[PDB]
Amino acid sequence: DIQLTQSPSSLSASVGDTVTITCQASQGIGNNLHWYQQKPGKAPKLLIYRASSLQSGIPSRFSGSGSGTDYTLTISSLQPEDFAYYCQQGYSYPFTFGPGTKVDIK
Amino acid sequence: DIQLTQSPSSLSASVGDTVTITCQASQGIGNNLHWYQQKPGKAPKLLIYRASSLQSGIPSRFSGSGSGTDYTLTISSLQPEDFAYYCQQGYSYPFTFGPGTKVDIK
Amino acid sequence: DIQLTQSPSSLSASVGDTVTITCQASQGIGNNLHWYQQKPGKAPKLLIYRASSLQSGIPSRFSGSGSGTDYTLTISSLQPEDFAYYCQQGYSYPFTFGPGTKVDIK
Amino acid sequence: ILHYEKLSKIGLVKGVTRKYKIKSNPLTKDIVIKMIPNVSNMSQCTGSVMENYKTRLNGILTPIKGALEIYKNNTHDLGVIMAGVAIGIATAAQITAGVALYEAMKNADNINKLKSSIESTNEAVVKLQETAEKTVYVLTALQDYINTNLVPTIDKISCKQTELSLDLALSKYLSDLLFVFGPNLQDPVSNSMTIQAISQAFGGNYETLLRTLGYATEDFDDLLESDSITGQIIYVDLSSYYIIVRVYFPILTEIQQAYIQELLPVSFNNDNSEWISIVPNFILVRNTLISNIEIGFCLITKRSVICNQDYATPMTNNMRECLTGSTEKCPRELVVSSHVPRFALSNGVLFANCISVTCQCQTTGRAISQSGEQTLLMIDNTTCPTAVLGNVIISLGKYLGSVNYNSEGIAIGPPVFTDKVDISSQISSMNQSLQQSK
Amino acid sequence: ILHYEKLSKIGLVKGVTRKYKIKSNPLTKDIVIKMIPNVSNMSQCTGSVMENYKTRLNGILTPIKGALEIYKNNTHDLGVIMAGVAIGIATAAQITAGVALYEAMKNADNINKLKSSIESTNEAVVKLQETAEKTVYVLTALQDYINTNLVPTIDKISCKQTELSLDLALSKYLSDLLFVFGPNLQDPVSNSMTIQAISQAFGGNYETLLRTLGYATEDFDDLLESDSITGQIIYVDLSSYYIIVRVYFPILTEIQQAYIQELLPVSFNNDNSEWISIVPNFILVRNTLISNIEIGFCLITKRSVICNQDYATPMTNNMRECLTGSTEKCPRELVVSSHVPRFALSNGVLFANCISVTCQCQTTGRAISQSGEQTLLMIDNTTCPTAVLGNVIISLGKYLGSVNYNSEGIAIGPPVFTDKVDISSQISSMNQSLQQSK
Amino acid sequence: ILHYEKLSKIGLVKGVTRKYKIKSNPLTKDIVIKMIPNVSNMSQCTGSVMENYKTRLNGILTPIKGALEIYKNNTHDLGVIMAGVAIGIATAAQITAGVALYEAMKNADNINKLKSSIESTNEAVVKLQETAEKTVYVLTALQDYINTNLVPTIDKISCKQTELSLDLALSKYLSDLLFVFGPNLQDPVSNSMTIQAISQAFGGNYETLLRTLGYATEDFDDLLESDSITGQIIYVDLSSYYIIVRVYFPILTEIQQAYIQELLPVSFNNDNSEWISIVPNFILVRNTLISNIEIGFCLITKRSVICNQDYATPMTNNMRECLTGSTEKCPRELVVSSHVPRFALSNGVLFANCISVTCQCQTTGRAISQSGEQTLLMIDNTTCPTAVLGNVIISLGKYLGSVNYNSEGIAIGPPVFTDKVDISSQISSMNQSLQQSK
Amino acid sequence: QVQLQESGPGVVKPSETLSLTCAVSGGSISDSYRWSWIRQPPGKGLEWIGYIYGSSTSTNYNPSLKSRVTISKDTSKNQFSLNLSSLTAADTAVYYCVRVVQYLEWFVDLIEVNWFDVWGPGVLVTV
Amino acid sequence: QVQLQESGPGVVKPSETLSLTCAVSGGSISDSYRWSWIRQPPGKGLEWIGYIYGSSTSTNYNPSLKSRVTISKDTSKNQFSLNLSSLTAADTAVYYCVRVVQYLEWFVDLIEVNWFDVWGPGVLVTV
Amino acid sequence: QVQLQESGPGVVKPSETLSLTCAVSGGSISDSYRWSWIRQPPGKGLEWIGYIYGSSTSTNYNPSLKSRVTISKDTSKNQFSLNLSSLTAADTAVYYCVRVVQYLEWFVDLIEVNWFDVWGPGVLVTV
Ligand SMILES: *[C@@H]1O[C@H](CO)[C@@H](O)[C@H](O)[C@H]1NC(C)=O
Ligand SMILES: *[C@@H]1O[C@H](CO)[C@@H](O)[C@H](O)[C@H]1NC(C)=O
């Protein structure tokens, strides 16, 4: 299987904060990496697919870019109501998720 | 060479008799098996060629049928004037004859 | 390299003499053999190229012919003013000359 | 989309339907191949063989390294950016392969940190620790022959004999190597050379290479035989004489609304002569779009067609009209050979030219006759439960088309000639007629 | 039937005539091939190699048995009758091959009564008694290598080394086997696969197989090199890992009133240029009927053409007119290469383009000159007993045609272009002209 | 002579230019190959293997000697004169090869004076003193296997086992030899057969043969891989079973005012669809004369094209007009596959179909757009210093053509279809239309 | 758009077979999509199980759970079912029936892109 | 139809060559048929010897007597001859010059069918 | 016709590089010919050195002196130069710049014919 790592692993923020996180892969996966939006207790959703494309209904503050084995996500001006996000690969079977850092309440 | 056997080896009959005989081969020969008509002291003739075809000038009582390695000949209502018959192969060189049973006078 | 030999190696003659000489090769060279005209202390010239073709400005007495590994040159009615001649090959690199016999003054 | 009932009447019977699959999403792994054996345990029996061998091998390997250096010297981090002016002339495939080479150089450096460990291997297959978590494998050519044959017989034969055997073995190895790694290899930057061809540097034993690398899937042999497993040379070392190869191992993707349909050709009767239809046997359908396919480059199995690229090719409007019902646009050719097929079976129903071949009904003992107006006969169990054709005796099912199949005729097409010299002759005659009309 | 005198004037000189022969009436024999060596005498040096090998071999062999079972389960004695509904779709060749497989099952059962004797063979070639009168031979792969190399050196090297050599040998054997016996073999029921291809299961040594079977004829090598000796797989055993093969050994039948005629092409002069005729080189005549032949699939010997099937193909009326005398229908092509032939010899008579090549008469020392109106010259001993052409000096015979050969002219045909892209260009231009006229 | 700017707009981008070289002026050397090993040191372990082997080999070798004797018996010194009446029928190449065979007979006799010395060789490679100044080399098949494997294990195994291994080895050698030296060899007089094919009589080790003969040059591998090194059989000995081979080793001659030009194909846009041009990729120019070349028979390197003969072929006037500027005569074909190239790089300048592929300017971050009226875009550093195409990031130079490249259009040509069955369909439809108009 | 519902026995004994049927509305199951199952054990994350093609009979399964699992579809009721065998201590989870979107990217070679966008409500299985 | 006549020396000494010429009437020897010889020793049956083609120069011989036998044909007199060498004790027989019919059957592959229909009166050779 | 002139340093010390430039009049150096150098040591004969093509950049050199030699051409002045390294005791000679004629003969195969016709006046180099 393809293994994913993330850095860093801490997201404790309030309204109006800017962050950047990185997802690394065991080998090159083109742009088959997606930043998801997991919803507690029901069907999840999506933030960015194909590593640079913004999902509809998402604030334009989020951005994503990467190449080869290294990909990055950039966020600004947090709203702390949202809960869960991850980096995921669909390059090789089976589909797997990374460790992840999500919106956390302090 | 291809070897032929026959069964049975006895034909002692008078006018009005029905017989069936079989010729077996060392391997499959298609339909390249013929039942001949040998004539004493001069040129012989033929009864059935290609294992199912009646020669001209022959009574329609004779019949022949077979497949693979086993072929059969059927005769009815003998006339004991005729003398000699055999099963012969023309599938492989040299051409050879079987043991045979012919019209015999008791 | 291709090695050339010549026979004989003595040309001591006066006006009005007929000679024949031979050039041999270590292998067949087609007709890539030429009889040259070397001039002392300046640019040389040519007698016969392609083993049978007469150069311009040359008396028609000279002739050449050969095949395979053996080639021959024939001369008649010498004029002793000329000085130097050779057999040369252009079949293989580098181009080389034979031992040679030329016009000699006694 | 195709009109099978009309096509069966011109001798084109429906065959098997197959799926369409193409390679994608490769997984990459690196491996070292050393092209010179270790002769430490027989060092007194070598003479001057090794020096001459190394001179020859250096002569072979120098241009490959020269070709790699062109892309290696002109590529750097900004993604990565190439210098077009220095490169000059290239195709898209070469440029993408250069990007891949630059991506592989990092692991190349990590592996090259173990040069002295590589030079000391004394077995055919050796494992080494690149990192605490990562390993790299080394395969050495001719090492098995040294270890199993020449070393165990040192005292039984003389030193000169051992030297001569080693010389012969090295020369045979070079003779086998030169077709793949010689002057024929003018473009090593690409990544389209098959793993079977690359394994000539290891005596042609690609099975051992793939087994050691650890690949394991259910589509393994299908990927092998479709030429879908490739490799790329990433580094050449001329003082230790070894190379580093990256192997690409893909998966197979099925195209959703596509299939390949096969047609079985049978001769037919028209105007007291025998004819065959000139129509392609494999047809590709994608989303109700019909085209040709260069199927000679793919692997054909009972359930699917497996290809390393998309091989669809265009088709004319006249042929498309032929396959959809207009049988008068389908050309035909005269039969002069006795080897052309005369019958076929489809969905348990027989289609046969009962004029060329003799047909009987086994059930009733009666003959089955075809008139001079018909092309061929359909035989099923509404008329003949069991049929006899020459040697064959066969029991039949029920047809699912029109009940009036054998009473309805068809419109025929125009004759053609497909011989190569006949093409030039026909073109010349047509041009002469066109000039004569004008 | 052909007009040789008229053809020689457009550079088509008469060559050798040859007979026509086709295979027929095969003789059948059976033989066993076991695809795993016996390791009883080195049982302590095998490790875990054999289990992995058996898993891989079972994966290879399972689909072949699956393919055979389809015909084996649906065929029984009434002649023999097949079940068409179960079979579904098949060609005539597949159906006939299935009949043959059913015929072979009896001897298959008789041989299979000796399974434990098959499993115990310890030599490359072993004979066993099937019956008091009939025998069966067993060939075992890699057994010679086991018996001659690994066993005699048991103590000279360590056990692990022996295991590694055996692993490498088995992997190389599989690497050679997968091209023939892998997924490429989707239809094993047929009997068209050559014995050379089948013998890859025994290391490619078909000579030993044929010698042990005992075949002996004067046409042996002609039958081998025409691809006329075939084999069919009849049974697969997956617990002992062996197969049974039936070999077909035919004779050659000469077709009575048929022959193949060869033509030798020579360049000729017309309008201050050099030309060559675009006409097939081999022509088949059967009972005064002229056709083409796909001779690339046959074996050409000095006296006959030997083929495994009838390869006749049709010819256009224009070309048939060309070969029977109408030289204005024979197309031609411009010469731009220096490698085209310029002379030939037929029945002791020279045909030469003495404009391109220099010709002398050795007997008189005079030049032989060709004018700008002639195509080529016939040279025989009524004018030149001995001729000189470049290096060659040749003495000649007497012509058997018209005395006025060199004073009578011919009518020429139209130029063509045979390049593949030029075909598309010409077709497009002709279509555009046809549209422009309308 | 070619119009590159006009051609680049229909997707034909300028590639590499190469020199043209042909083989000439060979140097000849003789060598002996003995096709039976010496078994003196294991004479008690041979059984009846050698007699059977010799019978088989004699049957193989007899027709070759018969074919040589025809020319040997009918040639004598006057230059040398052949007897045309006895020969009968022959090509020019066969006659020249016969002259060469007669030339070689003298050294053949000198070598044949050493028959007893030839029969006694006991190594794979042996030197013998033909004269005080000249030597001759002998290569013996299978001798290394005898000396290294069978002899050292005499007591380890039983006599029957040794005999069986020898039998298997000889049968395998014959199985490999038969394709080259069997009935396929109907004309041994010629000198066109490659040294690689000849070396099958020595197990396929041509490297050892060429190294022993002593040839050395910088163009060695280029001569090998262009199939330019050939050999001719000069003598066959049927009582000692050996042959004598003469090897021809040429040089390469460069043709002075000639070159081969390559074109790189790229798809382009017209009328909301994608197209590709049907034009040859390699073009030969000699003294400003344009022609085709059958480059599949030659060796392509980075700087030159190397051929064993002149391979020029003619071109039509329409195609020649296409290549010199008239783009309306260049045909085209529709694109239905996703594998066709979409961009290329020439002299540091990018040519790309920016409708099929996304193009971006890295310098300014702005998109690069192509309208529906354009075929493809030229991109250089007057507008885009660095460009991004998918993954690739590339820096660019300056174009040397017209400044108004992207604002000036071109005239297009007519569509075609190049499929083989489509050719017959189009020819039939054109003939039907021609008849309908009349 | 597409609506989904998972149905099956709420409580099943250990080592007993589990059949789960997902019923699809708002679309036809014969679409050119992929219908997948995802397992989310409480206290843990998500795990893909497998799928069956909408327009063909092909299937794909996770290597860890391949031997015990089967997937089938029914066009008449527009429902697809999963069968799991030998339920164990950790098999308690919530099962989602999802659609998987696929995109094909052609650039010299082929790359297929897969991601999750639309799932189902989910029901809990107790061992 | 075709008439045939065997002619030759009635009595020949042992180990002396035997030449037998069969003269053909009612037809041409250049027919597309086969002209064969059959040997019938008294007290024994028939056995085939060999043939030559009517429309070509090819020949075929029995393996048991191949070395001692030769067959030739003459179109001018329409006569075909057999030459046998080293006559022995058993060579006393009656020799028949016969016409052989051949049929070709095409069904996927080729099979040739051969049988005897017309023979000659026969003559006796005494050793 | 073509006129030639060799120019260079008359006397050079041993082991010092020697540059010799032949200037060509009566023709263009870009001709489809070969421009060669020939060395004639006093008391000895002639021996070929090498050449450069007129219509291309290819060069050819003698094996005996290959490592020490270089040849170049200049179209602007129509002059071609030879560079020799490590001059020794025997290197004293006269140097000739020569036009070399070539003819291609096609008869089944290809043979190239080369011969010397016109040279330069020559100059002397002293070590
Ligand atoms: C004819 O074949 C069909 C196909 O299976 C079968 O259902 C039907 O029973 C058959 N009818 C007869 C009369 O054999
Ligand atoms: C010409 O050749 C024929 C052919 O063999 C020969 O019979 C005849 O004697 C020859 N005539 C002369 C004059 O050489």
Q: Are strands I59-61 and E299-300 parallel, antiparallel or unpaired?
A: unpaired
* Resolution value in angstroms: 2.2
Nearest ligand (C-alpha, residue D399): 1
Q: Identify any residues that bridge with B33 across adjacent strands, giving them in sequence order.
A: B89
Q: How far apart are CA I89 and CA F96, in angstroms?
A: 50
Q: Indicate whether residue E398 lines ligand 2 (CB < 6 A).
A: yes
Q: How far apart are CA F37 and CA F148, in angstroms?
A: 13
- How many angstroms is it from C86 CA to the middle of ligand 2? 45
Q: Indicate whether residue D381 lines ligand 1 (CB < 6 A).
A: yes
Query: Does residue G106 contact residue A30 with C-beta atoms inside 8 Å?
Result: no
**Ligand 1 atom closest to the CA of D396, numbered from 1:** 2
Q: Which of E96, E253, E254 sits opposite H110 (nearest CB)?
A: E253
The DSSP symbol for D367 reads B
Write down which chains contact chain B via at least 3 CB pairs under 8 A. E, H
G and C touching (3 or more beta-carbon pairs closer than 8 Å)? no
Q: Tell me the three state secondary structure of residue I63.
A: coil
Q: Identify any residues that bridge with D343 across adjacent strands, giving them in sequence order.
A: D352
Name the token pair of I63.
């094996």
Q: How far apart are CA D183 and CA F302, in angstroms?
A: 9
D105 touches A at CB < 8 Å: no
How many interface pairs between E and F have CB atoms less than 8 angstroms apart?
178
Side chain identity, residue D175: S
Residues 6+ apart with CB under 8 A from D277: D10, D11, D12, D265, D330, D331, D332, D333
Q: Indicate whether residue D386 lines ligand 1 (CB < 6 A).
A: no
The DSSP symbol for C12 reads B
- How many angstroms is it from D377 CA to the middle of ligand 1? 19
Q: Do D318 and F425 touch (CB under 8 A)?
A: yes
Phi, psi (5° rounding) for residue C45?
Answer: -145, -165
Q: Indicate whether residue E385 lines ligand 2 (CB < 6 A).
A: yes
> Could you give the residue ranges of the DSSP H alpha helices within D226-379?
317-323
CA-nearest residue of chain D to F397?
A: D85
Q: How far apart are CA I40 and CA H103, in angstroms?
A: 86
- Rounded to the nearest angstrom, the minimum Cα separation between A14 and chain D is 33
Name the residue with tokens 């042999």: D221
Q: Do I110 and E338 touch (CB under 8 A)?
A: yes
Q: Are strands D392-395 and E80-83 parallel, antiparallel or unpaired?
A: parallel
Length of chain A in terms of residues written: 106
- Rounded to the nearest angstrom, the minimum Cα separation between D146 and chain H is 52
Sheet of strand B70-75, all strands in order from the earlier edge strand to the far edge? B4-7, B19-25, B70-75, B63-67
Q: What is the gyration radius of the CA atoms in chain G, in angstroms? A: 15
Pocket test for ligand 1, best of D381, D383, D386, D400 (most atoms within 8 A of CB): D381
**Ligand 2 atom closest to the CA of E397, numbered from 1:** 2
How many interface pairs between E and I have CB atoms less than 8 angstroms apart?
5
Q: Tell me the three state secondary structure of residue F199.
A: helix
- How many angstroms is it from D382 CA to the middle of ligand 1? 8
Q: Do D25 and A67 touch (CB under 8 A)?
A: no
- Burial classification of residue H75, based on how many CB atoms lie within 10 Å of its CB (0-12 exposed, 13-18 middle, 19 or more buried): exposed
Query: Does residue D223 contact residue D252 with C-beta atoms inside 8 Å?
Result: yes
Query: Does residue G90 contact residue G43 with C-beta atoms inside 8 Å?
Result: no
Residues of F in contact with I56 (CB under 8 A): 19, 254, 256
- How many angstroms is it from D381 CA to the middle of ligand 1? 6
- Rounded to the nearest angstrom, the minimum Cα separation between D103 and chain A is 8
**Ligand 2 atom closest to the CA of E396, numbered from 1:** 2
Q: How far apart are CA E277 and CA E6, in angstroms?
A: 13
Residues of H in contact with E308 (CB under 8 A): none
Q: Which of F25, F79, F103 sits opposite C91 (nearest CB)?
A: F25
Residues of D in contact with F400 (CB under 8 A): none
Half-sphere exposure of H114 (CA within 13 A, CB side): 21
Nearest ligand (C-alpha, residue D383): 1
Bond from prior residue into C94 cis (ω within 30 degrees of 0): yes
- How many angstroms is it from D390 CA to the middle of ligand 1? 24
Name the residue with tokens 């300014």: F364
Q: Do E338 and I106 touch (CB under 8 A)?
A: yes
Bond from prior residue into A8 cis (ω within 30 degrees of 0): yes
Q: How far apart are CA G120 and CA G82, in angstroms?
A: 14
Q: Whose CA is nearest to atom 2 of ligand 1?
A: D397
Q: Which of D89, D278, D414 sits opposite F432 (nearest CB)?
A: D414
Query: Does residue E166 contact residue E174 with C-beta atoms inside 8 Å?
Result: no
Q: Which of G32, G108, G110 sits opposite D256 (nearest CB)?
A: G32
- How many angstroms is it from E401 CA to the middle of ligand 2? 14
- Rounded to the nearest angstrom, the minimum Cα separation between I98 and chain E is 30
H107 touches D at CB < 8 Å: yes
Residues 6+ apart with CB under 8 A from D304: D18, D19, D20, D21, D254
Torsion of CA D378, D379, D382, D388, to 10 degrees: 170
Q: Indicate whether residue D397 lines ligand 1 (CB < 6 A).
A: yes
Q: Do H105 and B30 touch (CB under 8 A)?
A: yes
Which of E11, E13, E3 lies closest to E347 in space, CA to CA? Answer: E13
- E strand intervals along chain C: 4-7, 19-25, 33-38, 45-49, 53-54, 63-67, 70-75, 84-89, 96-97
Residues of D (56-75) whose Cβ lies below 8 Å from F: 59-60
Residues 6+ apart with CB under 8 A from D298: D226, D305, D306, D307, D311
G103 touches F at CB < 8 Å: no
Write down which chains contact chain H via at least 3 CB pairs under 8 A. B, D, E
Which of B106, B60, B105, B69 lies closest to B87 in space, CA to CA? Answer: B69
**Ligand 2 atom closest to the CA of E381, numbered from 1:** 1
- Rounded to the nearest angstrom, the minimum Cα separation between C32 and chain I is 6
Side chain identity, residue E265: P
The structure's method of determination equals: cryo-EM
Residues of F in contact with G110 (CB under 8 A): 338
**Ligand 1 atom closest to the CA of E85, numbered from 1:** 5
Find the helix or strand (DSSP H, E) in which E107 lies: helix E92-112
Residues 6+ apart with CB under 8 A from A19: A11, A13, A74, A75, A78
Name the token pair of C10.
């003595």
The Cβ of residue E158 has, within 10 Å, a number of other Cβ atoms equal to 11
The Cβ of residue E227 has, within 10 Å, a number of other Cβ atoms equal to 20
Residues of H in contact with D391 (CB under 8 A): 107
Torsion of CA G39, G45, G50, G52, to 10 degrees: 80
The Cβ of residue G110 has, within 10 Å, a number of other Cβ atoms equal to 19
Name the residue with tokens 């690739």: F392
Q: How far apart are CA D134 and CA D127, in angstroms?
A: 11
- How many angstroms is it from F72 CA to the middle of ligand 2? 22
**Ligand 1 atom closest to the CA of D381, numbered from 1:** 1
- I contact test, residue of E274, E336, E339 with most I CBs within 10 A: E339
